[PDB]
Symmetry: C5
Subunit: 212 residues, 5 copies
């Protein structure tokens, strides 16, 4: 019943509406959110030499894949709320503050008009298109670019991150370019920053392309 599904969504989001979306998605003991992160390269928009040196600005189109558990968004799918999943705007719920740390701009842009899917067990799946702009090195007809992703404010004890499906690499399931990929690797690291005390998960990707 369509009415019941919309009523369900309203009941679930009432918490976020009343208490706000800030803060880890827990009402009981504060736990650790483990985010599964995937980066799916679609295409290269441009690689533009910076001045006359060996560096360049690389602009990429990708699909970013995020999954995590939100215990506030759980329900028991017994009638009249027998729904396995519901679609939800990501601006109406908590979302991980994972940012492209080494963005040449403020951050990558994610398409936050795309909906997330939340399952009855509170697992959220959000797969936003993204534009990423980073500083690359262009030498010997190769463009080497790095991407570092991490939660802005939450340490490893608050927000953890692991490769979605344990695939430590740029994903090619949405790939739609003709570029020759010469390197494609990634690593998860727990990084201490000079400004701050505790450690933060960093997902670091290295992508090397043949120059056109």
């Amino acid at each position: 019943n369509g009415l019941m599904a919309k009523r369900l969504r309203r009941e679930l989001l009432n918490t976020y509406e009343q208490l706000g979306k800030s803060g880890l998605p827990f009402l009981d003991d504060i736990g650790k959110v483990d985010v599964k992160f995937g980066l799916s390269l679609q295409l290269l928009k441009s690689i533009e030499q910076r001045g006359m040196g060996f560096n360049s600005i690389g602009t990429f189109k990708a699909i970013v894949k995020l999954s995590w558990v939100d215990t506030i968004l759980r329900w028991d799918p017994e009638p009249p709320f027998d729904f396995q999943k519901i679609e939800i705007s990501p601006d109406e719920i908590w979302t991980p503050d994972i940012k492209l740390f080494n963005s040449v701009d403020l951050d990558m842009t994610l398409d936050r008009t795309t909906q997330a899917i939340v399952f009855s067990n509170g697992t959220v799946l959000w797969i936003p298109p993204a534009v990423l702009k980073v500083l690359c090195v262009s030498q010997d007809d190769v463009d080497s670019c790095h991407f570092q992703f991490g939660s802005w404010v939450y340490s490893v004890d608050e927000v953890d991150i692991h490769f979605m499906d344990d695939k430590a690499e740029v994903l090619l399931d949405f790939y739609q370019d003709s570029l020759e990929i010469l390197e494609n690797s990634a690593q998860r690291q727990e990084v201490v920053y000079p400004c701050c005390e505790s450690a933060y998960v960093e997902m670091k990707y290295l992508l090397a392309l043949r120059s056109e």
Copy 2:
């Protein structure tokens, strides 16, 4: 009477106001939406070569034609509501989340200030201008460009798509350019993705133009 036309719109949109626009547009049994989709090319803004290779970024101006049934928006056209249709803003109702998947930008942009028309039987007709930016291949004086569209989060059992008027081609009813069309074809496919275990409808268009 004008006031009655406005009260009708208010009465119809009350559901969306109280409950939000997320979720398939059904109040009773949740069915399948079937979107008729038409892509009407108007002009080419630019085709710009990427680096010194064979690919280029093609920027197009089009009109995207969408029609679907919203059962929430139905009325008996008996007086004093004897209106055949009413105009409504697309941001006050559910609209399909159809994205240009292979956009070089986050997505194509639709002019969401343009009104939709809704008829008394719940059929919605929305015809927004659109800007689309895709990767083309520019070889031997021919620019070949693909456009891939589909619902982001709804599978074929939830939101289906068919070509408007069953015309599987870029439509030329708004075409105002001087470019020579060398190929113009399109296919509807039900596609299974690695990430996800259901099939999604995709409309894939191929357009080839004589290069200027």
Copy 3:
């Protein structure tokens, strides 16, 4: 001027706030809006050749003049609302959905922060600055550009358009450029489009400039 003027505004706008701005501006019998439309070229921002062919993107700065009657916004200029006119934001009242049909972008842009003036008899006068981008033919030291304007969703029976001051031409009352105008004419037509059965008013301007 004054709190009573503001109280007058609140009363006039209560209908639009309660009922919404969508729908023809008619209190009682729904009639036809007659829009008076004026296009006043101010200057050329740029004319940029498209690739290596004879077409170009011409970007213009203009002032667009619009007037129409809104019978909802009428009042008797008697104590204590003895005002001949008041200023109102265009986004608080119905406005004609008149679009630049052949825009290379989604539409021309109008400055919707500029206020409209409403007179006690319901006559609205709104004169927003505008930026217009269209495809021109640049041949033989002449740039020839067209502009096609019309209501997006309203047919001739619903919204009509006529040239302001009866001048079927681009108006030069705000012209501050040095370009030589070589051709300047316009036509009002009632047009049937392949998608739809009703006739829509189209205003088509032809402008031709000596090239720099």
Copy 4:
């Protein structure tokens, strides 16, 4: 007391919240606003030749100085409200609709995130950074540009403007560039436009720079 300072703001703004920001800021009826206006050039962003002719688009960074009396925002500085002034967002009160009439874009841009200061007698001082884009003439190593400002919809009987501190020139109090200023004058005129009945104040500035 800091919370009393906030209570004062809330009480002052109550009127604007209840009645709206539109309309001249007299509490109430009869009155002419007199705006003091200053244009302080900070630097040249760029001058770009238009095509191959003698015209250019000049983009400038400036600080615009505005002051006027809002009689709605007056208070007696007696305890607990013994404040000589308070800060207020310009989007919470009426501001003059003073636009760059000859803008190549819709209008100059003002940083409306910057606060205004209001004194107890109702004097408002607002000093936003601004970006101004105009069409210049570039001949004989001189770039000559003009800037025209006026209220969009208010005539001289409604909104008047005078040069701040009676300085009829581009102010250099914030000048940080290296460009040689060759001419720098301004004139206040009362202008009748063909389109419209009344006279409107126009501050017309002339600035000539030695070309780099």
Copy 5:
């Protein structure tokens, strides 16, 4: 406990929601805010010569670190509110109107989606990514750029600024680029402007880079 954390935030923010975020952050006697300010250069996006002279527009990516005390945001860290800190959105609280005075655009941009952290004694720590665009001098293979930061409307008796950790230099703790830094110094100045009577704190940074 998660609910308590959220209830605490809502309680702290209740003042800002009822009275507004404008005005200095003092529950009682209005005092002087002391802002600690750090600028961490991350990378150079571009240095673009302006015209054909010796000036250039430098666009930088940085991380701005800001800290001050907000007495409104204090709480006793006693059960059930035994939390050492909570994260809060900078758009729900007062933040210093610290602007890049010599910005070539309206201002530098800060990523205001990033969360601030507030400690129980009212100390707020906010570390937004930033894009800074300024005018530089490019002579003898050196690009010299200045950056001037200050509160826009608050004088020294209202908002003070001091260098974070008393390091009067551009900080290199997030520096990810290959450019050689030739000069790096900064000074805190109290400045009186011609336009206005009080003294304002200005943090002036000098950065010189080896040209590529």
